Symmetry: C2
Subunit: 172 residues, 2 copies
């Protein structure tokens, strides 16, 4: 089921720059002076969508920048918000990443290089019955990667941008 | 006098993407579904700041993208909002522009090429006593261009982005 997502500004790392329509995210140079709510990521360059999922099957699409520094997928609600959090499935995030000109599934203890082509837009499919989060290149809906997870709590779309000069945008 | 400006989202052309903090603007691929206020530019890719000036001297700074398609400066309040408006001083806009890899003052009937070097951040100085809008490269505060105008109404900072892949941002 196609879901309409917006980014939740109360969760955003204060250095992120969200779009006014709450679909786009980049990294800024300077931390904004924002309320330091418990839900806000204070160190990792993350933001969640405002909608989380507890059951069923849902998908959404993400337009992705060509330059390094993004990662996106899903996170369990209980993901640590405060302090530098390892970027690993055990720490509650399941994500693809562009880093070093290369795409990765962010597995642990080593990340998993994908050898897909250039990515412009990616469909994320979450299946909470089967326990999967899957990524597809939209052009031909080619499968890129699936994490298999016995999700036991509410799961949120997750977006991260840790370098200037790239972006992610919930599409359309 | 240094002024703290924010973009006025009610004036923004619906294809523009404003930042949530109302300082940055880029052009999106698709028009958003926005309330068609009288103040909103419906055709030209323009947005005003929320603050207008009637007297005195004021300045602000604008971070600028390296790629073509931006223009910024000031507009008289009576600038036409509805329909395709010529981009000329006589139509109430006084601006610098990056187009064709070149910087221009948007004079009429012909634009005026500047021969400055690469611009990253530009200071706009508005002097309503003397009737001037001036542009400086911030690095060395080198004068780029001044328009002389007998302003007889409120003057608003003006920003325009007519190509994807570039941006402007009120700084810092």
């Amino acid at each position: 089921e196609k879901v309409e997502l917006t980014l939740d500004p109360d969760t955003a790392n204060p250095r992120l720059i969200l779009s006014l329509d709450l679909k786009g995210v980049r990294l800024g140079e300077r931390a904004q002076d924002l309320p330091n709510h418990p839900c806000r990521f204070d160190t990792n360059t993350r933001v969640l969508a405002s909608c989380g999922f507890s059951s069923g099957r849902h998908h959404w699409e993400v337009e992705v920048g060509s330059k390094d520094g993004w990662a996106f997928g899903v996170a369990r609600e209980s993901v640590r918000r405060k302090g530098l959090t390892p970027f690993t499935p055990e720490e509650g995030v399941w994500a693809l990443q562009l880093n070093g000109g290369q795409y990765w599934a962010v597995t642990s203890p080593e990340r998993s290089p994908l050898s897909c082509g250039h990515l412009s837009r990616v469909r994320v499919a979450l299946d909470l019955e089967v326990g999967a989060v899957s990524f597809y290149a939209v052009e031909d809906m080619r499968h890129l990667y699936t994490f298999r997870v016995n999700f036991q709590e509410r799961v949120f779309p997750l977006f991260s941008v840790c370098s200037t000069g790239t972006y992610l945008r919930i599409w359309p």
